[PDB]
C-alpha cells in the first residue's frame, strides 16, 4: 500500500507491539533515558539530573564490560542453550511482546549475565594475549 514514512509512538510506546517491530525503535527509548528557593528547589533538580546521568553511566559501563560498548545491538559468542524456553524464531520475533519474553526468561537471566561476563571479554581476551 501507499506510505509516507515512520511514526513516533513515544517513550515506552511500543510495549504492546511485537518484538520484530519494537526492536527497530530502541533509539527512542534510549534517547529519553539520558534565598529559600535556591537552597530547596534547585538542589533537588540538580540531584535528579546527577542521578539520571550516573544511572546512564553505570548502565553503559555494564554494557561496555561485555565488549558491547556504545552499540545498541551487538552479538556475542555464547550459544542459546535449549533449556532456556526454546521456541521457533518466527513465533519469538512475530507473536510475542517483550514483556511476555521477560516473563518467560526471568528465571534464567542472571545465568545469562554471568555467562556473558565470564566468557567473551574474558575469553576473547586472555586468548589474544597468548
Amino acid at each position: 500500500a501507499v506510505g509516507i514514512g515512520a511514526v513516533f509512538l513515544g517513550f515506552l510506546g511500543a510495549a504492546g507491539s511485537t518484538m520484530g517491530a519494537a526492536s527497530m525503535t530502541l533509539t527512542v527509548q534510549a534517547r529519553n533515558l539520558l534565598l529559600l528557593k535556591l537552597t530547596v528547589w534547585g538542589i533537588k533538580q540538580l540531584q535528579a539530573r546527577v542521578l539520571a546521568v550516573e544511572r546512564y553511566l553505570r548502565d553503559q559501563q555494564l554494557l561496555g564490560i561485555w565488549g558491547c560498548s556504545g552499540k545498541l545491538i551487538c552479538c556475542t559468542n555464547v550459544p542459546w542453550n535449549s533449556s532456556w524456553s526454546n521456541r521457533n524464531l518466527s513465533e519469538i520475533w512475530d507473536n510475542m511482546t517483550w514483556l511476555q519474553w521477560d516473563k518467560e526468561i526471568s528465571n534464567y537471566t542472571q545465568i545469562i549475565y554471568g555467562l556473558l561476563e565470564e566468557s567473551q571479554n574474558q575469553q576473547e581476551k586472555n586468548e589474544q594475549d597468548l
Epitope: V2, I4, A6, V7, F8, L9, G10, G13
Partner: nanobody
Framework: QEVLVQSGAEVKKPGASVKVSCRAF????????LHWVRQAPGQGLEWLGW????????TTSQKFQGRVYMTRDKSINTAFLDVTRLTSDDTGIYYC???????????????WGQGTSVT
C-alpha cells in the same frame, strides 16, 4: 475512548478560504496518519488528502494541488486544513479520520469526527 473533536459549522462566500481543525483525544496524535474527506449531500465519498502528524508531510490528489493545504500543531495536537477558492461544489460535510496504520501502510479509517458543515 479515542475521539476527534473539531470546530463548528461554517458558512463562507465563494472565492474565499475556509479553515477546519481536528484535535485528537485518547491516543498519541503523532502515532497514526490522518486523512481528510468531504461529502456533498446525496453523493458518495471522495477523498482530499492525508498527512503524517510527526513529519508534517502532506499528500493530496491529482485535482487539488494548490487548492487545499494541511498543517499540524503538536502542542495542541490539532491538524489544520485550509481550502482556497471556494465554489458551489465544495458545499458539504467534513470528516477527519484516523488511519489504523499497520505496517507503515494505509489500512483503514476507524476513528471519525462529527463533521464540519461548509456552505
Amino acid at each position: 475512548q479515542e475521539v476527534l473533536v473539531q470546530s463548528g459549522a461554517e458558512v463562507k462566500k465563494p472565492g474565499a478560504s475556509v479553515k477546519v481543525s481536528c484535535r485528537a483525544f485518547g491516543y498519541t496524535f503523532t502515532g497514526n496518519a490522518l486523512h481528510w474527506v468531504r461529502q456533498a449531500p446525496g453523493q458518495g465519498l471522495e477523498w482530499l488528502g492525508w498527512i503524517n502528524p510527526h513529519s508534517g508531510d502532506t499528500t493530496t490528489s491529482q485535482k487539488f494541488q494548490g487548492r487545499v493545504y494541511m498543517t499540524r500543531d503538536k502542542s495542541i495536537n490539532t491538524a489544520f486544513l485550509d481550502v482556497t477558492r471556494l465554489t458551489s461544489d465544495d458545499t458539504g460535510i467534513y470528516y477527519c479520520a484516523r488511519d489504523k496504520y499497520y505496517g507503515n501502510e494505509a489500512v483503514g479509517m476507524d476513528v471519525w469526527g462529527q463533521g464540519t458543515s461548509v456552505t
